[PDB]
Amino acid sequence: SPGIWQLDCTHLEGKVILVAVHVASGYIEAEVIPAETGQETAYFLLKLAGRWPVKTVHTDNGSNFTSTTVKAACDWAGIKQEDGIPYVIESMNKELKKIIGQVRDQAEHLKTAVQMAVFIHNHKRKGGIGGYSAGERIVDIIATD
């Protein structure tokens, strides 16, 4: 389970946000991209896979994931691509947009607000003052020694 990520997209202000969620921790990575193309999606996946030990990605089976460029990237990086596998995370894509609202007036451009929201989400302590943030949870889950 520690190598599983869920990908999804969010559209805001006529722009596309690609989001990767580490299922076990709730940690997120996101980028604003011009459109959901195979090349953009493949680049995103390649970046993510260089930064964390990514074994498996669950996707929404959008047409960007049927691109041969994305298939090639997943094969090169040793990612098992699992399309149409669903999976509180539902509450979270709604939650990123809420956080983006609380910082939007501090950023000239949307992409900056998106990275501010990612920062807030990842650093936020969950389950009270004795709890842990998504950033803390991911490193504790992944660390092997």
Ligand X SMILES: OC[C@H]1O[C@@](CO)(O[C@H]2O[C@H](CO)[C@@H](O)[C@H](O)[C@H]2O)[C@@H](O)[C@@H]1O
- Residues at the contact surface with ligand X, assessed by CB under 6 A: 31-33, 40, 43-44, 111
Q: How far apart are CA 10 and CA 115, in angstroms?
A: 14
The interface partner of residue 33, options being ligand SNU, ligand X, a copy of itself, none and the CB cut-off 5 to 8 Å by kind, is ligand X
The three-point CA angle 52-86-57 to 5° equals 25
Q: What is the dihedral of CA 27, 31, 36, 39, to 10 degrees?
A: -100
- CB closer to ligand SNU, 89 vs 139: 139
- CB closer to ligand SNU, 90 vs 145: 145
Q: How distant, in Å, are the alpha carbons of 45, 67, 105, 113 from that of 110?
A: 22, 27, 10, 5
- CB closer to ligand X, 17 vs 134: 17
What mask, x for binding a copy of itself by CB under 8 A, covers residues 112 to 131? Answer: x--xx-xx--xx--------
